[PDB]
Design a protein around this ligand. Sequence first.
Ligand SMILES: Cc1cc2nc3c(=O)[nH]c(=O)nc-3n(C[C@H](O)[C@H](O)[C@H](O)COP(=O)(O)OP(=O)(O)OC[C@H]3O[C@@H](n4cnc5c(N)ncnc54)[C@H](O)[C@@H]3O)c2cc1C
Ligand SMILES: Cc1cc2nc3c(=O)[nH]c(=O)nc-3n(C[C@H](O)[C@H](O)[C@H](O)COP(=O)(O)OP(=O)(O)OC[C@H]3O[C@@H](n4cnc5c(N)ncnc54)[C@H](O)[C@@H]3O)c2cc1C
Ligand SMILES: Nc1ccc[n+]([C@@H]2O[C@H](COP(=O)(O)OP(=O)(O)OC[C@H]3O[C@@H](n4cnc5c(N)ncnc54)[C@H](OP(=O)(O)O)[C@@H]3O)[C@@H](O)[C@H]2O)c1
Ligand SMILES: Nc1ccc[n+]([C@@H]2O[C@H](COP(=O)(O)OP(=O)(O)OC[C@H]3O[C@@H](n4cnc5c(N)ncnc54)[C@H](OP(=O)(O)O)[C@@H]3O)[C@@H](O)[C@H]2O)c1
Lengths: 108, 108, 320, 320
Amino acid sequence: SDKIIHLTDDSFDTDVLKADGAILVDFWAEWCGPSKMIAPILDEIADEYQGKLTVAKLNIDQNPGTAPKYGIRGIPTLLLFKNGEVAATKVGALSKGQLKEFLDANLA
Amino acid sequence: SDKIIHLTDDSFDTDVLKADGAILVDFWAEWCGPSKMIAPILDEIADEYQGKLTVAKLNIDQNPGTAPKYGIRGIPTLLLFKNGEVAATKVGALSKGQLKEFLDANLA
Amino acid sequence: GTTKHSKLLILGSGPAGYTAAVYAARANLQPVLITGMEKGGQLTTTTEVENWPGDPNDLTGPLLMERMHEHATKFETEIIFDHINKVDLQNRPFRLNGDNGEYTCDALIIATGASARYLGLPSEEAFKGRGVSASATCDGFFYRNQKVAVIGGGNTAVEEALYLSNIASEVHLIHRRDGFRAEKILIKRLMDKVENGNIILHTNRTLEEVTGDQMGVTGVRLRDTQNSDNIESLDVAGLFVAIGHSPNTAIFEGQLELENGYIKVQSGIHGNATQTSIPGVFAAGDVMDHIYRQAITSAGTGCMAALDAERYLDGLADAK
Amino acid sequence: GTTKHSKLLILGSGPAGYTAAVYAARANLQPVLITGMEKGGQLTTTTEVENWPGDPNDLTGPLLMERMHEHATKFETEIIFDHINKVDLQNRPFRLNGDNGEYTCDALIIATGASARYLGLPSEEAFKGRGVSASATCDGFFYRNQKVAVIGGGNTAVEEALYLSNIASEVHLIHRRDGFRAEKILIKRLMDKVENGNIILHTNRTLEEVTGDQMGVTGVRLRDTQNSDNIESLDVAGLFVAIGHSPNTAIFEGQLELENGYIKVQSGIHGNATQTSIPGVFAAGDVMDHIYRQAITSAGTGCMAALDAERYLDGLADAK
Ligand SMILES: Cc1cc2nc3c(=O)[nH]c(=O)nc-3n(C[C@H](O)[C@H](O)[C@H](O)COP(=O)(O)OP(=O)(O)OC[C@H]3O[C@@H](n4cnc5c(N)ncnc54)[C@H](O)[C@@H]3O)c2cc1C
Ligand SMILES: Cc1cc2nc3c(=O)[nH]c(=O)nc-3n(C[C@H](O)[C@H](O)[C@H](O)COP(=O)(O)OP(=O)(O)OC[C@H]3O[C@@H](n4cnc5c(N)ncnc54)[C@H](O)[C@@H]3O)c2cc1C
Ligand SMILES: Nc1ccc[n+]([C@@H]2O[C@H](COP(=O)(O)OP(=O)(O)OC[C@H]3O[C@@H](n4cnc5c(N)ncnc54)[C@H](OP(=O)(O)O)[C@@H]3O)[C@@H](O)[C@H]2O)c1
Ligand SMILES: Nc1ccc[n+]([C@@H]2O[C@H](COP(=O)(O)OP(=O)(O)OC[C@H]3O[C@@H](n4cnc5c(N)ncnc54)[C@H](OP(=O)(O)O)[C@@H]3O)[C@@H](O)[C@H]2O)c1
């Protein structure tokens, strides 16, 4: 809630694809429950990872372009970028601990 | 639905108390389930007991003036009249056999 | 001489019966359900329902059952208005007689629920319809702005005093224990009124007699549960007995294992939990539950009765 | 340092838990409920729900569950978004460990439900997220006018097949047998669509492997159950596995008597029916039901759990 970005198909190439640093991407959709279930976790994460990561949500419900580009045929799917480069991805719902396990595994 | 006399507070004595013959009076209300659960059985009684009995439904939702008159502090309550004369009375719900077992034990 | 056969026959139109109905219907079992004299079940004798998971507001026993009924017929359940007063479970198909015919079924789901208890006093019976009532829902308005009395200590008793308290000038709650078994949240609303409102407690008392004249009840006489010889009068215009319910199993008397009136069922965590002592005969709802007795628990076992009967009827179709 | 303590704690935000939540909240047990990662339960992964008694039309899992959340919070249930990783049931108060903090409670209601089951094929894993999916309601979007597969013969498969049917160009239902276990009413909808719709039946076949490239799943290989080596190839855009579930009882390893994954309860027609192996610990919902597993049965048991918990907690207060 202090770094989250309502990313769009336009402001992506510039935001994620080209920005030194790790920006996590939570692909969601108003129709997929577990999708929006991760948003809260991202916020509880926003602070603890503020300086190593920037949580950025993306609504394919109104932003198609993006998803296909990376072959994402499932939601929610998380993409951990590093200098506009998919470095790691996690699929499906998960707990704050499984997500911190994921970030600490790569992002460090 | 065509024999059961849907009485009215005013037109009561002018119906049940004066008109000769054994006429059964059903005091009911749209708020008392058991009251409206009798409606069916009364039909299969107006027919199954025709000529030897008359059925009259005195709803009280909007006809309170009559109930008091006989000391009816509870519905549904059935009063078996005989020209302004209570011959019998049946307080409470009941099945078809129930009602008939009362109509027979009484009527002659 | 009209006899009716059906693979599946459901006895009861309460939440248990109706849930067994929608499940059986969706199993294309073509179920026939007999409503019983109290169509809708007990929930029809109450007002607001607050514990039916998913309906947090404005739900009423009547409305819920209006919805369940609609729901049972959506999948073409055959609802017949009738009461059953005799059954032969010793021979197949099963024999059930009502005020409209003979019924035969290859499987039977019993969901007859329970009926309001009674005190068994001649004064109590002598004043019905004239002061002694069974439903505040029905007669409550005959006591507006008058002294009224309730007797019981469970959720009904309490919900009745709470309900009546907004009608009668004052409510007198009579009960044996010094404590109530009604849900906590409710006892609080109760006590709040016993304090700032018009509800008056009469703990440790037992109704000895309903007194009155040739026009209706005018008072009630209580007895002490501690001092056997101490007694007290109570000027009251009406009495509502709410001392529980007894399971509807007289017709099944000597037809299947009954334990204190409640139909005994296999239970267990190995399926076929709603099966009575007679194969093909299942029980659900309050008729087979003397502990919980809730709308939601009854809906559940009702669902189980269906799944159990289907699993049973499937077997018969395979031997065919 | 700030371990949150409570008389009762409920695990799970599904129908079973939320019902226990509200019944326990009314017994004024000031319940604390932990949602889990799948807040709302399995029902949240479905669309229409046709057998929730009293909801004849247009009801959807999400809706029913959003309604239960509201209901449980209405009676002041402390709902906490968290997931329990470890539990200690040998020391009272019981110790439960979650990602957002540590919890202790005098009584516990385990309503952890179950998770989607998988085959165990690495190809299945390799493509999860790129063609292999568990929820159609979530990913059916990615298959507009494309061929897609479903594997399983239960209600979930059929419904997903039926649902996918109006999204994909063609649906291929794969199953280990010639027979389906889903409700008839549904099996009928299936065939009726198999006969003149876009659903293709692939009976007596089992998922042997999922094929594809960096861009996702391109097809699958079924096996044929009646000819060990008849392996056939099927060109498809993605597949949804629907082969049942398994109770979420891992965090309870060797602390509660389990039976094929499911938590064992006393059951029986004498109360304390949801009592687990450890006094003061109860289980309701699919986590303790290997048979019926419906939303209505889960809500039923969640209720008994709350009531059993109260009977227990009161006992503690009494014997003090
Ligand atoms: C005033 C009151 C308020 C209540 N409030 C709540 C509440 O807020 N929440 C809650 O969870 N629970 C509440 N309950 C309890 C709840 O009503 C029951 O646990 C539940 O409805 C029982 O369901 P059932 O289907 O088993 O039986 P019932 O509802 O009793 O239904 C039995 C059915 O069987 C039929 N029947 C009986 N005998 C025969 C026969 N011989 N032949 C044919 N048909 C027959 C009847 O006509 C009826 O349709 C309340 C009860 C009362 C009395
Ligand atoms: C697509 C689909 C459709 C369905 N449709 C229907 C239908 O139409 N009708 C019907 O009657 N039934 C239906 N069901 C079945 C029904 O969903 C289950 O019977 C029911 O939800 C069981 O309820 P439950 O509360 O026991 O468990 P669940 O609903 O599975 O919920 C379990 C809860 O436990 C939580 N949890 C798990 N582990 C932990 C932990 N370690 N820490 C914290 N929280 C934890 C989860 O977050 C979740 O909230 C369907 C199932 C599926 C998959
Ligand atoms: N919300 C709601 C509202 C009404 C009913 N229900 C449920 O439906 C079921 C039945 O409720 P109910 O209230 O009608 O009946 P129940 O909960 O069994 O309570 C009955 C109450 O009546 C008392 N009682 C019984 N027989 C009596 C007699 N012969 N003389 C005097 N009192 C008598 C009884 O006394 P106690 O056992 O405490 O000493 C008790 O206080 C329960 O499972 C309720 O929780 C839920
Ligand atoms: N309305 C609705 C919608 C979905 C689920 N539900 C209920 O929720 C519960 C679970 O339903 P579900 O469909 O997810 O799972 P369930 O009813 O348990 O049925 C499972 C289906 O998957 C099959 N299966 C299981 N393991 C498999 C394996 N390893 N490989 C291949 N197939 C496998 C299984 O085959 P079968 O035994 O018939 O030969 C069966 O076809 C049930 O109790 C349902 O009644 C209701």
